[PDB]
Enzyme design. Structure first.
Site, PDB file in Angstrom:
ATOM      1  N   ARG A  80       0.067   9.093   1.255  1.00 24.85           N
ATOM      2  CA  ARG A  80      -0.673   9.015   2.521  1.00 24.85           C
ATOM      3  C   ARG A  80       0.011   8.085   3.534  1.00 24.85           C
ATOM      4  NH1 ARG A  80      -3.454   6.363  -1.335  1.00 24.85           N
ATOM      5  NH2 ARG A  80      -3.492   4.082  -1.099  1.00 24.85           N
ATOM      6  N   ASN A  81       0.862   7.188   3.032  1.00 30.08           N
ATOM      7  CA  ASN A  81       1.618   6.252   3.866  1.00 30.08           C
ATOM      8  C   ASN A  81       3.104   6.606   3.949  1.00 30.08           C
ATOM      9  OD1 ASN A  81      -0.402   4.549   4.936  1.00 30.08           O
ATOM     10  ND2 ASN A  81      -0.440   3.292   3.074  1.00 30.08           N
ATOM     11  N   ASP A  87       0.827  -1.219   0.000  1.00 30.24           N
ATOM     12  CA  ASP A  87       0.000   0.000   0.000  1.00 30.24           C
ATOM     13  C   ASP A  87       0.860   1.267   0.000  1.00 30.24           C
ATOM     14  OD1 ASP A  87      -2.878   1.169   2.007  1.00 30.24           O
ATOM     15  OD2 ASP A  87      -2.263   1.658  -0.038  1.00 30.24           O
ATOM     16  N   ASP A 119       2.655   2.357   7.352  1.00 32.03           N
ATOM     17  CA  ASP A 119       1.335   1.937   6.903  1.00 32.03           C
ATOM     18  C   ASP A 119       0.329   2.203   8.006  1.00 32.03           C
ATOM     19  OD1 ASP A 119       0.194  -0.813   4.810  1.00 32.03           O
ATOM     20  OD2 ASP A 119      -0.969   0.723   5.834  1.00 32.03           O
TER      21      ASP A 119
HETATM   22  C1  LIG Z   1       3.743  -0.736  10.099  1.00 31.19           C
HETATM   23  N1  LIG Z   1       3.315   0.203  11.126  1.00 31.19           N
HETATM   24  C2  LIG Z   1       2.986   1.474  10.925  1.00 31.19           C
HETATM   25  O1  LIG Z   1       3.038   1.946   9.810  1.00 31.19           O
HETATM   26  C3  LIG Z   1       2.564   2.339  12.065  1.00 31.19           C
HETATM   27  C4  LIG Z   1       2.472   1.988  13.505  1.00 31.19           C
HETATM   28  C5  LIG Z   1       2.720   0.759  14.325  1.00 31.19           C
HETATM   29  O2  LIG Z   1       2.056   3.108  14.159  1.00 31.19           O
HETATM   30  C6  LIG Z   1       1.892   4.114  13.173  1.00 31.19           C
HETATM   31  C7  LIG Z   1       1.481   5.413  13.411  1.00 31.19           C
HETATM   32  C8  LIG Z   1       1.372   6.270  12.314  1.00 31.19           C
HETATM   33  O3  LIG Z   1       0.980   7.565  12.506  1.00 31.19           O
HETATM   34  C9  LIG Z   1       1.915   8.515  12.849  1.00 31.19           C
HETATM   35  C10 LIG Z   1       3.210   8.166  13.238  1.00 31.19           C
HETATM   36  C11 LIG Z   1       4.128   9.158  13.580  1.00 31.19           C
HETATM   37  N2  LIG Z   1       3.775  10.451  13.538  1.00 31.19           N
HETATM   38  C12 LIG Z   1       2.527  10.823  13.160  1.00 31.19           C
HETATM   39  C13 LIG Z   1       2.190  12.174  13.116  1.00 31.19           C
HETATM   40  C14 LIG Z   1       0.904  12.556  12.725  1.00 31.19           C
HETATM   41  O4  LIG Z   1       0.544  13.879  12.678  1.00 31.19           O
HETATM   42  C15 LIG Z   1       1.366  14.893  13.256  1.00 31.19           C
HETATM   43  C16 LIG Z   1       0.517  16.122  13.580  1.00 31.19           C
HETATM   44  N3  LIG Z   1      -0.124  16.660  12.370  1.00 31.19           N
HETATM   45  C17 LIG Z   1       0.843  17.472  11.603  1.00 31.19           C
HETATM   46  C18 LIG Z   1       0.152  18.091  10.390  1.00 31.19           C
HETATM   47  O5  LIG Z   1      -0.960  18.876  10.833  1.00 31.19           O
HETATM   48  C19 LIG Z   1      -1.936  18.113  11.551  1.00 31.19           C
HETATM   49  C20 LIG Z   1      -1.286  17.473  12.777  1.00 31.19           C
HETATM   50  C21 LIG Z   1      -0.039  11.591  12.374  1.00 31.19           C
HETATM   51  C22 LIG Z   1       0.292  10.241  12.413  1.00 31.19           C
HETATM   52  C23 LIG Z   1       1.574   9.863  12.804  1.00 31.19           C
HETATM   53  C24 LIG Z   1       1.678   5.834  11.022  1.00 31.19           C
HETATM   54  C25 LIG Z   1       2.095   4.524  10.799  1.00 31.19           C
HETATM   55  C26 LIG Z   1       2.195   3.677  11.894  1.00 31.19           C
END
Ligand SMILES: CNC(=O)c1c(C)oc2cc(Oc3ccnc4cc(OCCN5CCOCC5)ccc34)ccc12
Length: 296
Positions: free
Chosen positions: A160-161, A156, A174
């Site tokens: 977005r990933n 995938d 992911d």
């Molecule tokens: C194979 N495993 C994975 O991919 C993931 C696992 C086990 O946990 C995850 C968590 C994930 O999400 C994030 C990870 C790390 N940082 C992140 C930061 C995020 O947003 C930051 C704040 N935003 C900035 C932009 O404006 C709105 C607020 C969202 C999601 C985030 C993605 C992917 C994964």
């Protein structure tokens, strides 16, 4: 066959009481990612902002099993700058399964690039440049080359990933269950599943074959996303039987607004009809490294 993989609790287990959960970062039907503060997860007695993936109300044990396999595969893969980095897990009975990864300041790359249309110049502080775009592309290629070396494939790959952290570092991830694929327009109903059709190789659509070379196809679509600054692939095209037919015939996307000629040719190379004729991620690393140097 992830179920046979080890989980070393002595190395990876993190106490739940040292994790302070906060605001949601993404939610699906059965999964979610939440921002948290973790005390001493990677450095002795120092607080660290992290992201944690866990299940939601509605989830069943099958989703729990899937999250455990996800943890196990992340351990197998190991650390690389350009893969979201696993910091620990909460697996002990009496609480939910939590998988803890490094926090990436800017979140997913698709949304980020889409926000920078008025803050881009090809060649102004905090402005994106052509160099940034080629650099992100190179980094994702490096991360995918690494994943391939671990005998793993993504299935995938898309903007977005990809996560953007500080100092222009991007990381493959992911969201999986933490994305609402029933509500997300990127995932189209095909049989008994919702699939990212616009990112899928013909052999994946028609034969349900997933390989590292089908990941290369997706990487081409990712390149298009980067050099369109987060646009949606195949603009104004209905994703139906005719789309899939024309794709197998040889129909390809036009050059995005911010591409260079060689970047567009790289996209077309990734979209070769024959999987074995597409470049490998190792070839892409070499080529994009050359392009990044030519830019500077
Ligand atoms: C194979 N495993 C994975 O991919 C993931 C696992 C086990 O946990 C995850 C968590 C994930 O999400 C994030 C990870 C790390 N940082 C992140 C930061 C995020 O947003 C930051 C704040 N935003 C900035 C932009 O404006 C709105 C607020 C969202 C999601 C985030 C993605 C992917 C994964």
């Amino acid at each position: 066959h992830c179920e046979r993989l080890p989980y070393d609790a002595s190395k990876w287990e993190f106490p739940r009481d040292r994790l302070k959960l906060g605001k949601p970062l993404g939610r699906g039907a059965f999964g979610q990612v939440i921002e948290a503060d973790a005390f001493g997860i990677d450095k002795t007695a120092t607080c660290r902002t992290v992201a944690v993936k866990m299940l939601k109300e509605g989830a069943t044990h099958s989703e729990h099993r899937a999250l455990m396999s996800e943890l196990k595969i992340l351990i197998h893969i190991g650390h690389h700058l350009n893969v979201v980095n696993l910091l620990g897990a909460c697996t002990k009975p009496g609480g939910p399964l939590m998988v803890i990864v490094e926090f990436c300041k800017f979140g997913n790359l698709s949304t980020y690039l889409r926000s920078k249309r008025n803050e881009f110049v090809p060649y102004y502080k905090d402005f994106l440049t052509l160099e940034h775009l080629i650099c992100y592309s190179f980094q994702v290629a490096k991360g995918m080359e690494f994943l391939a070396s671990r005998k793993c494939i993504h299935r995938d790959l898309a903007a977005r990933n990809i996560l953007l952290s500080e100092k222009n570092v991007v990381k493959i991830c992911d969201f999986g269950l933490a994305r609402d694929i029933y509500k997300d327009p990127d995932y189209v109903r095909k049989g008994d599943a919702r699939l990212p059709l616009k990112w899928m190789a013909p052999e994946t659509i028609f034969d349900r074959v997933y390989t590292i070379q089908s990941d290369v196809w997706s990487f081409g679509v990712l390149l298009w996303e980067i050099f369109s600054l987060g646009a949606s692939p195949y603009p104004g095209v209905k994703i139906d039987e005719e789309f899939c037919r024309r794709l197998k015939e040889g129909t390809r996307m036009r050059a995005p607004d911010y591409t260079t000629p060689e970047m567009y040719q790289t996209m077309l190379d990734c979209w070769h009809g024959e999987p074995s004729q597409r470049p490998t991620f190792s070839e892409l690393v070499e080529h994009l490294g050359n392009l990044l140097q030519a830019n500077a």
